[PDB]
Motif scaffolding. Structure first.
Motif, PDB file in Angstrom:
ATOM      1  N   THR A  77       0.730  -1.295   0.168  1.00 56.55           N
ATOM      2  CA  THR A  77      -0.251   0.252  -0.076  1.00 56.55           C
ATOM      3  C   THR A  77       0.864   1.557   0.108  1.00 56.55           C
ATOM      4  O   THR A  77       1.833   0.944   0.010  1.00 56.55           O
ATOM      5  CB  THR A  77      -1.163  -0.015   1.017  1.00 56.55           C
ATOM      6  OG1 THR A  77       0.445   0.831   2.587  1.00 56.55           O
ATOM      7  CG2 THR A  77      -1.505  -1.324   1.377  1.00 56.55           C
ATOM      8  N   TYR A  79       2.404   4.144   2.001  1.00 53.77           N
ATOM      9  CA  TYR A  79       3.190   4.208   3.386  1.00 53.77           C
ATOM     10  C   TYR A  79       2.541   6.141   3.822  1.00 53.77           C
ATOM     11  O   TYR A  79       2.814   6.581   3.235  1.00 53.77           O
ATOM     12  CB  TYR A  79       4.949   4.139   3.202  1.00 53.77           C
ATOM     13  CG  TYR A  79       5.204   3.806   4.467  1.00 53.77           C
ATOM     14  CD1 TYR A  79       5.077   3.395   5.400  1.00 53.77           C
ATOM     15  CD2 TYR A  79       6.125   5.504   5.084  1.00 53.77           C
ATOM     16  CE1 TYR A  79       5.792   3.294   6.396  1.00 53.77           C
ATOM     17  CE2 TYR A  79       6.350   5.421   6.121  1.00 53.77           C
ATOM     18  CZ  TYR A  79       6.484   4.315   6.961  1.00 53.77           C
ATOM     19  OH  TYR A  79       6.913   4.367   8.160  1.00 53.77           O
ATOM     20  N   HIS A  80       1.885   5.869   4.901  1.00 55.51           N
ATOM     21  CA  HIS A  80       1.790   6.930   6.122  1.00 55.51           C
ATOM     22  C   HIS A  80       2.897   7.374   6.719  1.00 55.51           C
ATOM     23  O   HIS A  80       2.779   6.626   8.483  1.00 55.51           O
ATOM     24  CB  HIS A  80       0.379   7.537   6.350  1.00 55.51           C
ATOM     25  CG  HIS A  80      -0.486   6.718   4.862  1.00 55.51           C
ATOM     26  ND1 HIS A  80      -0.079   8.188   3.843  1.00 55.51           N
ATOM     27  CD2 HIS A  80      -1.205   5.960   4.401  1.00 55.51           C
ATOM     28  CE1 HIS A  80      -1.323   7.767   2.818  1.00 55.51           C
ATOM     29  NE2 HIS A  80      -1.622   6.638   3.293  1.00 55.51           N
ATOM     30  N   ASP A  87      -1.585   5.349  17.455  1.00 55.66           N
ATOM     31  CA  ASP A  87      -0.056   6.528  17.209  1.00 55.66           C
ATOM     32  C   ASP A  87       0.268   7.807  17.494  1.00 55.66           C
ATOM     33  O   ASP A  87       0.911   8.066  18.306  1.00 55.66           O
ATOM     34  CB  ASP A  87       1.102   5.844  16.223  1.00 55.66           C
ATOM     35  CG  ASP A  87       1.254   4.669  16.622  1.00 55.66           C
ATOM     36  OD1 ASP A  87       1.876   3.615  16.713  1.00 55.66           O
ATOM     37  OD2 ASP A  87       1.294   4.179  15.126  1.00 55.66           O
ATOM     38  N   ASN A 132      -5.985   1.641  13.086  1.00 56.53           N
ATOM     39  CA  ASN A 132      -6.690   0.981  11.741  1.00 56.53           C
ATOM     40  C   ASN A 132      -6.736   1.873  11.019  1.00 56.53           C
ATOM     41  O   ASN A 132      -7.883   1.619  10.315  1.00 56.53           O
ATOM     42  CB  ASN A 132      -8.094  -0.115  11.288  1.00 56.53           C
ATOM     43  CG  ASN A 132      -6.772  -1.076  12.206  1.00 56.53           C
ATOM     44  OD1 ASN A 132      -6.065  -1.605  11.972  1.00 56.53           O
ATOM     45  ND2 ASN A 132      -8.125  -2.281  12.067  1.00 56.53           N
TER      46      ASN A 132
HETATM   47  C1  LIG Z   1      -2.818  -0.827  10.070  1.00 54.89           C
HETATM   48  O1  LIG Z   1      -3.372  -1.886   8.795  1.00 54.89           O
HETATM   49  C2  LIG Z   1      -2.078  -1.155   7.901  1.00 54.89           C
HETATM   50  C3  LIG Z   1      -1.180  -0.245   8.449  1.00 54.89           C
HETATM   51  C4  LIG Z   1       0.098   0.275   7.301  1.00 54.89           C
HETATM   52  C5  LIG Z   1       0.542   1.286   7.251  1.00 54.89           C
HETATM   53  C6  LIG Z   1       1.090   2.414   5.931  1.00 54.89           C
HETATM   54  N1  LIG Z   1       1.582   3.577   6.442  1.00 54.89           N
HETATM   55  C7  LIG Z   1       2.360   3.318   7.897  1.00 54.89           C
HETATM   56  C8  LIG Z   1       1.934   3.205   8.926  1.00 54.89           C
HETATM   57  C9  LIG Z   1       2.984   2.865   9.823  1.00 54.89           C
HETATM   58  C10 LIG Z   1       4.296   3.830   9.404  1.00 54.89           C
HETATM   59  C11 LIG Z   1       4.959   3.986  10.854  1.00 54.89           C
HETATM   60  C12 LIG Z   1       4.673   3.793  11.772  1.00 54.89           C
HETATM   61  C13 LIG Z   1       5.165   4.404  13.748  1.00 54.89           C
HETATM   62  C14 LIG Z   1       4.093   4.672  14.249  1.00 54.89           C
HETATM   63  C15 LIG Z   1       4.320   4.955  15.733  1.00 54.89           C
HETATM   64  N2  LIG Z   1       5.859   4.077  16.182  1.00 54.89           N
HETATM   65  C16 LIG Z   1       6.635   4.284  17.284  1.00 54.89           C
HETATM   66  C17 LIG Z   1       7.402   3.719  15.042  1.00 54.89           C
HETATM   67  C18 LIG Z   1       5.929   3.174  13.606  1.00 54.89           C
HETATM   68  C19 LIG Z   1       3.208   3.307  11.988  1.00 54.89           C
HETATM   69  C20 LIG Z   1       2.089   2.894  11.485  1.00 54.89           C
HETATM   70  C21 LIG Z   1       1.611   1.525   8.855  1.00 54.89           C
HETATM   71  C22 LIG Z   1       1.289   0.605  10.491  1.00 54.89           C
HETATM   72  C23 LIG Z   1      -0.198  -1.033   6.670  1.00 54.89           C
HETATM   73  C24 LIG Z   1      -0.591  -1.884   5.910  1.00 54.89           C
HETATM   74  O2  LIG Z   1      -0.838  -2.859   5.125  1.00 54.89           O
HETATM   75  C25 LIG Z   1       0.350  -2.677   3.849  1.00 54.89           C
HETATM   76  C26 LIG Z   1      -1.588  -2.118   6.946  1.00 54.89           C
HETATM   77  O3  LIG Z   1      -2.563  -3.081   6.365  1.00 54.89           O
HETATM   78  C27 LIG Z   1      -3.700  -2.617   5.520  1.00 54.89           C
END
Ligand SMILES: COc1cc(-c2cncc(-c3ccc(C4CCN(C)CC4)cc3)c2C)cc(OC)c1OC
Ligand SMILES: COc1cc(-c2cncc(-c3ccc(C4CCN(C)CC4)cc3)c2C)cc(OC)c1OC
Ligand SMILES: COc1cc(-c2cncc(-c3ccc(C4CCN(C)CC4)cc3)c2C)cc(OC)c1OC
Ligand SMILES: COc1cc(-c2cncc(-c3ccc(C4CCN(C)CC4)cc3)c2C)cc(OC)c1OC
Lengths: 290, 286
Positions: A77, A79-80, A87, A132
């Motif tokens: 996907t 990336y955020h 968080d 989520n």
């Molecule tokens: C929920 O679900 C999915 C999420 C994602 C996803 C997409 N962008 C960014 C993230 C992310 C980046 C970085 C952090 C940080 C937070 C603070 N911490 C201390 C360090 C880590 C958290 C989250 C994620 C997790 C991708 C997925 O699929 C590819 C997901 O599944 C559908």
């Protein structure tokens, strides 16, 4: 070509990596073998071209790969880098503008899921929670994780509940999920489960909005009434037996925005699922609130 | 850290149809076959993907799975199935321009029976599998390997315990009497289709300097692209079966194969041989 750069999450679900692809950050989820039915369901949901929306996590690719007896299951996907709403809320307070932007964006994504396009079926999420929801640099959010989703087409009278024995995150489960009386062959039942969980996310966000120099610390729903790592039965006790709902801090009632939000989250939390607001009505109400 | 090389070079198109296309591709140091699905046939990608997400089939006589890939495009979803590549192509192709001896005929048909029995059998425990019926067995869905054995392809219509090719449909499918709630029904439809494949192959086995030309089943009684009704009249109403040439009865192998194919073609589905019984019979020939 994808380069896996760092692990940004690891759990029972599997793992998520920040990767590089065509010189852009991407998110790469590698599913646990225990959760292969979520991978397939999420892939069925992302097949829908008209699912795409500013407030739904953007799909790039899905893969199942195997050699010999080993299978890998991948979802790629957008990336955020700000991470999840869960968080974000632990390290930031909000002003009125930011709080309303966040919750309207989530309402917009959820109404987009729930409402059929004549195409995209009507979709209920079934695992809405602050982990989520991802936070975007424009101050809006997008909803993620369609592995438990249910689809319905009004035009053809078809309900697709899928095959996944996964259940929702226990802390966010509606009363009818915890007491197992939910009507499993009724699409509206699943939308009303999402509305319950949305109410909880509203509460989590609103706690972090400052009013009159006061803000609450981040806490997850029911933090005060259940054990750490609450079981299904722990949640059933507080929600169904004790009829608990998250408490509204009295400081909210001095602020017009938080007073409106408290009213809105109470209308997500009726024990009678049919009393709960619709996603569209929440979106319209938040659009009118300032 | 981990480079995940996903680039597949599509080198040449080896098949085009209503299903979409098949390409010879290159990944790293493996030739691969890439099936690119038409919008018409998206359900076949989902069904084969769901099956391989349920059980990772691994068998010498089953086309080898490598990957299922879904990629987002501007206005569409692109669906690819990636498998082992068999440069000799389909059995249908191969039989057009090749005749067989006794050893090569038996090796082909026993390998198909082996793959089909593997699909059909439920295996219990870890590294087990559900029973599977194929539902579109035919010579175009069988690939020839360099070692002389074949493998079964295309699980897009498979069922675990958008209609099959009409020319190969069993009588109970054509007359709509099939017991649709009974899994054994689907195995017995595959056995019928196996018998037709066995006939197509046996025709190309030389005996006493004689061979038949390649023909598809029922070539003499239905048109190309036969209708459902065309097939029902032949198979159900008139109860026709493919011709066994007299020259087969001078050859012990083709005499045995004729008997086997007639035990795949009973009107009564429950009278048909099982894939395991076909294997046993084939191992006792020559
Ligand atoms: C929920 O679900 C999915 C999420 C994602 C996803 C997409 N962008 C960014 C993230 C992310 C980046 C970085 C952090 C940080 C937070 C603070 N911490 C201390 C360090 C880590 C958290 C989250 C994620 C997790 C991708 C997925 O699929 C590819 C997901 O599944 C559908
Ligand atoms: C999809 O297809 C192909 C894949 C690959 C391939 C590439 N990198 C790594 C791997 C791999 C390494 C290690 C494990 C295991 C080892 C034991 N335990 C610890 C669990 C983990 C699994 C997988 C593979 C199999 C190569 C192929 O061809 C040579 C493939 O075929 C085209
Ligand atoms: C996503 O997409 C495609 C991926 C690949 C591919 C390429 N390199 C390496 C891999 C690989 C395999 C397995 C592991 C294991 C290693 C050890 N264990 C502990 C967990 C994970 C890691 C990496 C893969 C799967 C090929 C493709 O095509 C042939 C892909 O596209 C369909
Ligand atoms: C039946 O179905 C599937 C088949 C295959 C597949 C696998 N190996 C090889 C082939 C092939 C290669 C080469 C030729 C020609 C080219 C040169 N010459 C003029 C005669 C021979 C034909 C065929 C195919 C088509 C893959 C599939 O999926 C990826 C299939 O679908 C499940």
């Amino acid at each position: 070509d994808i380069t896996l750069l760092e692990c940004v999450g690891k759990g029972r679900y599997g793992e998520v990596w920040r990767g590089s692809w065509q010189g852009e950050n991407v998110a790469v989820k590698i599913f646990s073998s225990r959760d292969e039915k979520s991978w397939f369901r999420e892939t069925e949901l992302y097949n829908t071209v008209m699912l795409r929306h500013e407030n739904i996590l953007g799909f790039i690719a899905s893969d199942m790969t195997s050699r010999h007896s080993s299978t890998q299951l991948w979802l790629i996907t957008h990336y955020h880098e700000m991470g999840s709403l869960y968080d974000y809320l632990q390290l930031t307070t909000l002003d009125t503008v930011s709080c309303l932007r966040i919750v309207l964006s989530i309402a917009s994504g959820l109404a987009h899921l729930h409402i059929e396009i004549f195409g995209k079926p009507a979709i209920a999420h079934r695992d809405l929670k602050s982990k989520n929801i991802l936070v975007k640099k424009n101050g809006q959010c997008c909803i993620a994780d369609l592995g438990l989703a249910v689809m319905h087409s009004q035009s053809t009278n078809q309900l697709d509940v899928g095959n996944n024995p996964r259940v929702g995150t226990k802390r966010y489960m509606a009363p009818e999920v915890l007491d197992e009386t939910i009507q499993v062959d009724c699409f509206d039942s699943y939308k009303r489960v999402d509305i319950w969980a949305f109410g909880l996310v509203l509460w989590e966000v609103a706690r972090r909005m400052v009013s009159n120099g006061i803000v609450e610390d981040y806490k997850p729903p029911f933090y005060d009434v259940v054990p750490n790592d609450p079981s299904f039965e722990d949640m059933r006790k507080v929600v169904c037996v004790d009829q608990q709902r998250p408490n509204i801090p009295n400081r909210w009632f001095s602020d017009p925005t938080l007073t409106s939000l408290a009213k809105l989250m109470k209308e997500c939390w009726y024990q009678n699922p049919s009393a709960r607001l619709t996603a569209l009505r929440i979106k319209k109400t938040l659009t009118k609130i300032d």
